[PDB]
Each structure stands twice: as C-alpha cells, then as structure tokens.
C-alpha cells in the first residue's frame, strides 16, 4: 500500500480506493441522504500495521479517526463543510472500510 505521514507521524498506510458500501441507518430518509452525499465521504482509509495493536477495535478506531481527520483537513481547504449527520455517516462508512482493511491484514498474516 502507499506509505503516508499524517499529523507529523509516519508509518501509516493509505489503502486503495474502494467501492464504498451502502450503509443502512434505520430510516429511509437517512438512507437516501447517505446515497446522495456518500461521494463527499472518504473512499480510502489510513491505517497502521496490525502488529502495532493487540486487538481489532484499536486498529479500526485509529483508522476511522485519522482518516476522517485527514479528510476533514484536506476537504475544508477546498470549501467543504460537514454537518453532524455527515460526521456520523462518515464514521459508519469509514468504520466498515477499516474493518475490511483489518480483514485483509489479518488474512495476509
């Protein structure tokens, strides 16, 4: 994967561009909001080697947090603004893409 530096720390990986999963939120309305806005959300995740964690939840938390930090930084310079709903939705889709990444790392091991 590509090596990356985020927030002045290296050792991150940037995954491939992924097919973002459709997420369900428990209302048709929010589902359709997601479909209409998902292009604004990440489709690539930042992660660290599996060996830097003792458990999956910590791997995935870092991947969610840093991805959304980096995305928010780079997109705010191009004029983006995210609402509370956007942030919640990004946390869910990025969490699924980070779990997929964890599975890929765990099968490689």
């Amino acid at each position, epitope marked *: 994967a590509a090596g990356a530096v985020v927030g*002045g*720390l290296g*050792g991150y990986m940037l995954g491939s561009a992924m097919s973002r999963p459709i997420i369900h939120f428990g209302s048709d309305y929010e589902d359709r909001y997601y479909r209409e806005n998902m292009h604004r959300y990440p489709n690539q995740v930042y992660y660290r080697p599996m060996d*830097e964690y*003792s458990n999956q*939840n*910590n*791997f995935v*938390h870092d991947c969610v947090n*840093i991805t959304i930090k980096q995305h928010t930084v780079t997109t705010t310079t191009k004029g983006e603004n995210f609402t509370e709903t956007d942030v919640k939705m990004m946390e869910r889709v990025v969490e699924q893409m980070c779990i997929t990444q964890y599975e890929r790392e765990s099968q490689a091991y």
Partner: nanobody, 123 residues
Framework: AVQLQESGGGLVQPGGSLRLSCAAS????????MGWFRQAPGKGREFVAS????????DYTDSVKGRFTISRDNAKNTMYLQMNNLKPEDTATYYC?????????????????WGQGTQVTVS
C-alpha cells in the same frame, strides 16, 4: 533528553484501586500528547489510555473504559492513571510514553520516550 519515570505500581486486590504517576524531566511537558501502555508476560505492549497536550481530549482501550481515568498536571510535569475496579486481566508492567505527531492514537508506533515501567499485580 526528556526522560519519563513511572511510579505507583504494586500488589492490589481484585476490585481495588491504584493511582499511577508519570513524571517527566525537561521543560516541554505541556507541548506533547502523552499515553499509557501495558505489557504482561507473553503479550506485547498494548494501548491503555492517552491524553492531549492541553488535556482537552482523552482516549481509552475498550477494556478499561469506565474504570480508568487519565489526567495530567501541566504545572507539575506529571501525568496520572487512576485505576479503579482492578481485575486480574489488568496485571502488567505499565509504561508511560510521549506522543509522536499531533494526534493521539492507539498504535504502539504513536509514542516514544518509554519509561522503565511500573509493575501492577492484581492478586
């Protein structure tokens, strides 16, 4: 070279309480995020909790959330870990560390300046 020293370890009964301290030498304590990790024999060094430079945000591994509390005294070059409701699975050497970069993370690669550790044994 900033150095960090853990203290406060010991033998504690299940359900009991201990407070660890991390003291830093130097004059840049408040400029850096900080964290606590733990290592038991047969396991690697794993995330426990972290706190930003200012104290504005903290983070915990899931197994300690609600039981342990990280804090820092920026005027005294000291970080603390209050550990409540201790369990046998919490037995480990506890290490404090200084954050790398501007973001607190859970990865072992996100910190350096490791102390020599303090041993916590929960009967």
């Amino acid at each position: 070279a900033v150095q960090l020293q853990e203290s406060g370890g010991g033998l504690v009964q299940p359900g009991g309480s201990l407070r660890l301290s991390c003291a830093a030498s130097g004059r840049t304590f408040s400029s850096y995020n900080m964290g606590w990790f733990r290592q038991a024999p047969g396991k690697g060094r794993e995330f426990v909790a972290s706190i930003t430079s200012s104290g504005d945000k903290s983070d915990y591994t899931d197994s300690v959330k609600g039981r342990f509390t990280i804090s820092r005294d920026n005027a005294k070059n000291t970080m603390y870990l209050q550990m409540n409701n201790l369990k046998p699975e919490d037995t480990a050497t506890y290490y404090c560390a200084r954050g790398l970069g501007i973001y607190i993370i859970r990865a072992r690669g996100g910190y350096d300046h490791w102390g020599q550790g303090t041993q916590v044994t929960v009967s």
